[PDB]
Subunit: 379 residues, 4 copies
């Protein structure tokens, strides 16, 4: 029995605003040219958005217009809100190419896949809640359920656990944090009310909820003026909220703004896929698959499956099962997971994993050919 | 028995070049004004360095000159090398200002501490080697031991392991990767020779070395023109090479460019400290400590110590020990670890942890009060 | 008898906004270090101000804060107005240094001095009115005499003339133009009313005024959302409104953002001085002096005084008188005209010439030694 | 009898490099879409080019690639030269838009036309030589006639005059200046030798040449490098070299980067046309025509023809003859002068006037319906 903490941030967060914008460009490209190559990043500050990077593509794209559209969508239409899509400046330092006239990996790296049967989404509950908490603030903001709300927001769900010999059963949410931006025309008392009633309660399960849970509502006091004004923001800086909330591991690879040819993304996705499959097939309760690649080398340089002593068969075997049933060549990962599609913008917020959108072909498990010795496997 | 892989990159790597530059500014500030507040980031691309962020300080600083000095130091003096400190452009978008130990943590977040007695440095061997491999390429480049060498370089050490009931004993280096930039006046064959003879051999222990060890020397073929030219680079994008090579966990917090008031750094450091202490004291073989904080709240919001079943004491008994002996208030963490001191530039390369520089006050363990009930623990 | 046209623009005009900002930096520098060297320029667009250039100085300056202060002063405090000093972005790409009489002209060039006794200010009436017209719109805006007014504005005064054997006597204002920005709460009819009554009438002399005089009040229709938003603006792009409204000549030298060591400014100023003196001493009715310099050469490379046949003395004599009484060495020009002073910001709007501010040491004539053969000349 | 000075600069000059780049974009646009609207500017500093402005067009353009191509063409291969087209950074802040005779002038303004029969090109000899001097340095650089030469260069031709009855007859070149950039592998003595032998002598007529003529060859001493590195450069800053070398007048309107719908260009061109015609028809020896426009008003709001007493009738007639034979509506000017064509890049250097390129439809005069009473005029 122990406690754990995870966090998440809203799409109004400058760091995440970048992630979004970057993947907006990518989508824009794949839309016209699926074979596009996009390795681009966004940086934003006081009154500015600077898009910088490289893109090989045939697609005729209007970058500044895409950018602005994303900022608008996020809700930044007023300078008093801290950002204005209509009046802000957009510097493009992207070097575009025409390219006009299987697949060794494009870069070397390390990538991680994680999965836990503690939740339906095969994700750490601690992370799920944290992010759901945030998606709800969006709903509230957009739908008018809480009109005083503003885009730049942040959350944190630390919760209690227990481990039944490797199986994680969560008990209760020990403490809770949420720091949102807001209009000046709202009472501190009025905020707490709305936050508890219309977000916390409506997202946190009653089973885990208590009279006994701690509450931290804008403990920094007030938060009217925010957004990218004052703070600086960059692509791929929220790498952990993008993934597993620090539960598994990370390879260091920022996902957003990178096309699927980048092993950093593909490998990370395929890794999730494997893991999600491995726990589905009842081979284990908890897994952490690690993949690794060499620049210019098509096949994976190394492979590791770390089940937390939970997995019934054993790791020498698992590592094999994976290899037999999965083609981990970047080129094929793209094909199998349909990563040439324009689905990546929506990936940029509320986490890349745990979401069962149809286009997220890595969240639907595979069916794995198993040696007959382990035909008795699990629930 | 199993395999694992970790990676590292050189200070010539654009992503890391930023990390360095950012921390160069920080140092520059703390030099004159220790009470300085710096939340600043760097971005670079083809011919350009863009410094953006915010910093409250009394220090009179020459940012462009600092920047250039860092680029020069790294070795980028020629456009043919891919970057020129003398000729490149420097855009400053930093907003400069003029401007107790119970201070509330100036942000919310999650932070991780890791330690393993598998090595003298209390670090994952896989990571140690990977980074040592890189530091040696520097030595060679700078000292002229391999003059054809160039700054932009990358490494990857995947190695074989065994676990003796929680204790990690490494067996052999299964495979090795190293992709360096170089002058066009080199023979592909000549590179492999020098790489094996003057780096690999002189860093990798003979005990772990063998004839069946795999070697990947610039498998991307050639690599003459590189650096920030072609690639884009940002601060805090190499968060994993900066820490534990994906062995433990991460909170998502980019270290570089942030002053020590930022919990993302302090908490991460203090966490390492705890861990390093916890296995000094023979309480365990392997630990991962997780800290967590709330914005505006001085005390840590939550705490967790995950020893990998290697801990003699049993789990909750020591979460206590930590609390008793450590003051995890950000304000104190600065004082105790002497984080007001301009030591942060050198932190920006070759990893923040595992290095026993005197100024790294978090690498020298603490001495902890222990209930006498625990007289039997570890060597 | 003939007609002529000249124009002017307000300090809200982006092109002029730059000129101002640039000279704001200069002033800021000379304030601390009179021996400062400043060759810097400003560019502005939609949400952005980019300062680029070079400055050798000991002065410790806060450029972004200076910039913002200038924009504020001009009245751009709202995004709806087209610009916001509070929310806009400021990119500094200027390279600052620490500084390590008969002295070399710092650059080669060609410069012009002009003067006409047609007016008290020794300036073309056509230009005087045009600019006065604009200064009045400022007065009205600032003083609240016309609160609906907005900063970005423009004017144009085309005037009828007659020449009495070289002497220009103006007859009447043939046509008039004025295009101002404004709040959207104002009626088209209400604008024309206020413009005629509170500016035109209060600036244009009744002697020159008529019932037949043409009037062009925002003929582009509406003009609510203007400023640097939409329109690109640069330093030294309004070189003619800065000087003589196209009456004399120009050397091409942008004045603003350049310190007084730059012959482009000094020579131009000294030239005005000479001219103003030459017509004061009753040597002529109308003069256009041209100066010319060589890079690294202290003395003027060439000299020319073109009186429009209005000069009693004959030209060969004049250019002598000039030489005898004036020290046209850049080094001296600075000393004599007190150009080490922070007076240059206010020079950046409403024209560099014709204004009898005490600090404008080039508007107060000299007393010249004249051959006794021609004590009979003009009033 | 008197002296006069004019100047010019090479296409390597940063200020002029911008002018070129800007008009390169324009051409690029008109190429696909003649009805394009382009109001864009370039700014350059160290290893950086910033393109900013607005363009309404259907044309699909690759701005960074065009830019780079222009810089290359100009000769900046080596960061060693002060600029490198291959390695420099390109920031695009241009706001691009799809597109939704007798139209109103787009903007208000003042414009000038000048012509002098002192030379074949109907231009001031002082300016012609100055610029020819520079074109020759190009020839030499490009053709290898002087391989040590480098692109950033500057010239200045001050020459002696006489006017006989309003007719300017030039006598001799009093002094000469030329400051060129160069390779470090060449001597100061060797430089002087070349410029005198292979430029000065091969451009300056021997009739105007002599032994007493002054020579200023890199008086700033050395000039190994240069370019945009260490100088700042902007579009439309060399407005005088672009036109008449300060002989006539200027309206303040920067030509380059503006499409022909901009009266600043059209009016200036049409003005030259008129003047060139007026002196061709033997109506006078020397003319300066001034045009003037109102925003949104199609017809010219004012008109003036200043012949320097060198015209053969009153000046009210001339003003008539102009009106009768020319349609000065911006809309028509475009049609008659074929200003929808991509000819504007080459205009950006060596002056907009005096060059008898076929595409320069404003340099070939018109035939004017003059009265029968004035059938006796001029040679």
């Amino acid at each position: 029995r122990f406690f754990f903490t995870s966090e998440s941030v809203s799409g109004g967060h400058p760091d995440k605003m970048c992630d979004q914008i970057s993947d907006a460009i990518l989508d824009a490209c794949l839309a016209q040219d699926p074979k596009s190559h996009v390795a681009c990043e966004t940086a934003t500050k006081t009154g500015l958005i600077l898009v910088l990077g490289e893109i090989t593509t045939n697609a005729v794209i209007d970058i500044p217009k895409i950018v602005r559209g994303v900022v608008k969508s996020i809700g930044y239409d007023d300078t008093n809100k801290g950002f204005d899509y209509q009046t802000c400046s957009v510097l493009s330092c992207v070097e575009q190419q025409s390219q006009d006239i299987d697949i060794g990996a494009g870069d070397q790296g390390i990538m991680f896949g994680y999965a836990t049967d503690e939740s339906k989404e095969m994700m750490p509950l601690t992370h799920v809640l944290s992010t759901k908490l945030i998606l709800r603030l969006q709903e509230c903001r957009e739908k008018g359920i809480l009109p005083w709300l503003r885009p730049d927001s942040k959350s944190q769900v630390t919760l209690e656990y227990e481990e039944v010999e490797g199986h994680l059963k969560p008990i209760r949410v020990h403490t809770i944090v949420i720091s949102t931006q807001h209009a000046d025309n709202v009472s501190n008392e009025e905020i707490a009310k709305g936050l508890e009633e219309e977000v916390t309660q409506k997202v946190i399960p009653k089973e885990l909820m208590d009279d006994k849970m701690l509450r931290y509502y804008n403990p920094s006091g007030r938060f009217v003026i925010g957004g990218p004004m004052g703070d600086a923001g960059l692509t791929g800086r929220k790498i952990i909220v993008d993934t597993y909330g620090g539960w598994g591991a990370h390879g260091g690879g920022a996902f957003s703004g990178k096309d699927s040819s980048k092993v950093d993304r593909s490998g990370a996705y395929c890794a999730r896929w494997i893991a999600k499959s491995l726990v589905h097939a009842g081979l284990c309760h908890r897994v952490l698959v690690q993949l690794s690649y060499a620049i210019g080398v098509s096949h994976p340089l190394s492979i590791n499956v770390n089940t937390y002593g939970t997995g019934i068969c054993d790791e020498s075997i698992l590592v094999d099962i994976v290899n037999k049933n999965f083609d981990m060549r970047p080129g094929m990962i793209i094909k199998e997971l349909g990563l040439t599609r324009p689905i990546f913008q929506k990936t940029a917020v509320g986490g890349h994993f745990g979401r069962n959108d149809p286009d997220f072909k890595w969240e639907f498990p595979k069916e794995l050919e198993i040696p007959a010795e382990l035909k008795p496997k699990l629930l």
